[PDB]
Design a protein around this ligand. Structure first.
Ligand code: T3E
Lengths: 309, 252
């Protein structure tokens, strides 16, 4: 009944709610305004539905990760607020890439698209450097500030990784941006899976729509083979030892049409070459965050440009 | 802040508990007890010492904000351990933790029916308390693991397994028995434990080829004056702890 001390956890009432930004009845995510400074923020309530084990361990993980990740291209957790209910408070970001790509009016120059991809890849390089896998790459999880700075967002499915043989969770990542490794049942993966996601997003910068929209995992794996060729120990050395390799009904006459199928939407040869190196089948031969930033795509005309426009 | 959870001796004197009439002495005991309870439960729940330590630190910090007069250790400890286990990726089931707490605190008492009102109540009581912990610590649960430091330390000094074992021993006890973790950074505490371990086992670390003492390579702030003062304090309380020293005493 008596009130108790809490110097380090403010009541969320300091913020004034404005409008449910997620709009997908997901997260209980609100835009808000600090009642004193007018500072805009995003509030995510910590879902307590069917929490039988106290504070959700998944929340704890995400919180651990947001606190660790402090970087210009990564969403910023300002603080956690109380009320019983709990809210993650973020710096508000005006736009998010998914919305911009779907908006017919919005239009990117090659120079600006370069900048976006540059910031995004930088973000990945940073989070991986810090032993974190994002595990949910998709345009929707990529925000851009009113000042044109890209922020990687939504670390709810992220997790720390390391060297040891690892046993990680398999059904991570939205279906359309999920990489081959996972769909073949791999549980000892790493940063290469986020790069695959970066690939689908890069291509999405011109197609304005997710390139590979499968209904089921075999359906998705079909689409991928009908873009990057089919899984061969020749193309992907050692795919064999995965139990589901032909046991997932896969074609055999598929030859990579990444550059052909997208030739249309993307003109610039460098852009296509980079996409091609991101959407590689074998995770071990898939280009990494560092090499990507080195790619001539970022060092040719038009050079990458800021984008307040 | 970086120095939010580090306190001066004067701040330690003026603890929340002191404000409710608790002697400096009693408070220190209340802490040591909680730490024992955490150790006992953690061993039975079969979690790591890392996790037990993490819980102990939460406890120490929790009581720089809250009073023992309002929150008994016998309550905070199980909640803190429950939490620590989750944070360190050794999650233990709520029922399981409540079960072990019960038998540690009431070895004779009869386990209640997990259907009773009285049990359903204490389940929610623990959850409630975990929450009061999270809010008191301001959701800052990443601890800097002191052992990792001792290892690197004893190593970049080339000590026998024995010397090393003993230093780890010193570290673990400094956590149960002192509030060093509330005053000094893990790297410093690590030096203190190595210093005392050397003193205890007559080992003498030769000055580096320069003339600089080993600890200067571990932390620039550290001085021989400080190390001697802190090892003396730690050794004093070690001498008050029945059988504790027997564990590292050379019986041969
Ligand atoms: C559902 N996933 C997300 N969680 C958080 C916390 C998100 C977030 N979103 C924004 N801005 C934003 C997101 C979607 C749509 C729009 S808009 N322009 O109003 O339609 C703005 N800023 C920060 C965060 C964070 N963290 S998104």
């Amino acid at each position: 009944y008596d009130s108790v001390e809490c110097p380090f956890c403010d009541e969320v009432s300091k913020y004034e709610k404005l409008a449910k930004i997620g709009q997908g009845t997901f997260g209980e995510v609100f835009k808000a305004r600090h009642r004193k400074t007018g500072q805009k923020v995003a509030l995510k309530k910590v879902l307590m539905e069917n929490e039988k084990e106290g504070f959700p361990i998944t929340a704890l993980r995400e919180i651990k990760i947001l606190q660790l990740l402090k970087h210009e291209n990564v969403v910023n957790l300002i603080e956690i607020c109380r009320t019983g209910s709990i809210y993650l408070v973020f710096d508000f970001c005006e736009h998010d890439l998914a919305g911009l790509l779907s908006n017919v009016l919005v239009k990117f120059t090659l120079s600006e698209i370069k900048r976006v991809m540059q910031m995004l890849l930088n973000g990945l390089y940073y989070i991986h450097r810090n032993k974190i896998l994002h595990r949910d790459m998709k345009a929707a999880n990529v925000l851009i500030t009113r000042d044109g700075v890209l922020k990687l967002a939504d670390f709810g499915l992220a997790r720390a990784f390391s060297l040891a043989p690892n046993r990680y969770t398999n059904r991570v990542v939205t279906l359309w941006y999920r990489p081959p490794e996972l769909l073949l049942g791999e549980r000892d993966y790493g940063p290469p899976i986020d790069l695959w996601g970066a690939g689908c997003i890069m291509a999405e910068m011109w197609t304005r729509s997710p390139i590979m929209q499968g209904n089921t995992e075999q359906h998705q794996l079909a689409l991928i083979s009908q873009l990057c060729g089919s899984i061969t120990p020749e193309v992907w050395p050692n795919v064999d030892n995965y139990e589901l390799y032909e046991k997932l009904e896969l074609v055999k006459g598929q030859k990579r049409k990444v550059k052909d199928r997208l030739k249309a939407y993307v003109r610039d040869p460098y852009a296509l070459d980079l996409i091609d190196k991101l959407l590689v089948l074998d995770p071990a031969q898939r280009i990494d965050s560092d090499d990507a930033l080195n790619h001539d795509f970022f060092w040719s005309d038009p050079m990458p440009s800021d984008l307040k426009g | 802040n970086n120095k939010r959870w580090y306190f001066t001796r004067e701040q330690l004197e003026n603890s929340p508990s002191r404000r409710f009439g608790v002697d400096p002495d009693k408070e220190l005991s209340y802490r040591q007890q909680a730490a024992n309870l955490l150790q006992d439960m953690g061993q039975r729940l079969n979690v790591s010492q890392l996790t037990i330590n993490t819980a102990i630190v939460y406890m120490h910090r929790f009581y720089m904000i809250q009073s023992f007069t309002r929150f008994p250790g016998n309550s905070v400890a199980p909640a803190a351990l429950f939490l620590a286990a989750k944070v360190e990726g050794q999650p233990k089931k709520l029922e399981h933790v409540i079960k072990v707490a019960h038998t540690c605190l009431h070895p004779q008492e009869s386990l209640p029916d997990t259907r009773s009102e009285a049990y359903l109540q204490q389940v929610q009581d623990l959850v409630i308390l975990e929450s009061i912990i999270l809010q008191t610590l301001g959701f800052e649960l990443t601890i800097d693991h002191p052992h990792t430091h001792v290892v690197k330390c004893t190593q970049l000094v080339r000590a026998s397994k024995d010397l090393a074992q003993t230093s780890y021993f010193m570290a673990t006890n400094s956590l149960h028995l002192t509030t060093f973790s509330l005053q000094y950074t893990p790297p410093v505490v690590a030096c203190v434990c190595i210093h005392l371990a050397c003193k205890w086992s007559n080992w003498e670390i030769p000055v580096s080829t320069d003339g600089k003492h080993w600890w200067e390579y571990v932390d620039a702030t550290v001085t021989l004056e400080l190390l001697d003062e802190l090892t003396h304090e730690l050794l004093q309380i070690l001498e008050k702890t029945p059988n504790r020293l027997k564990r590292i005493w050379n019986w041969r």
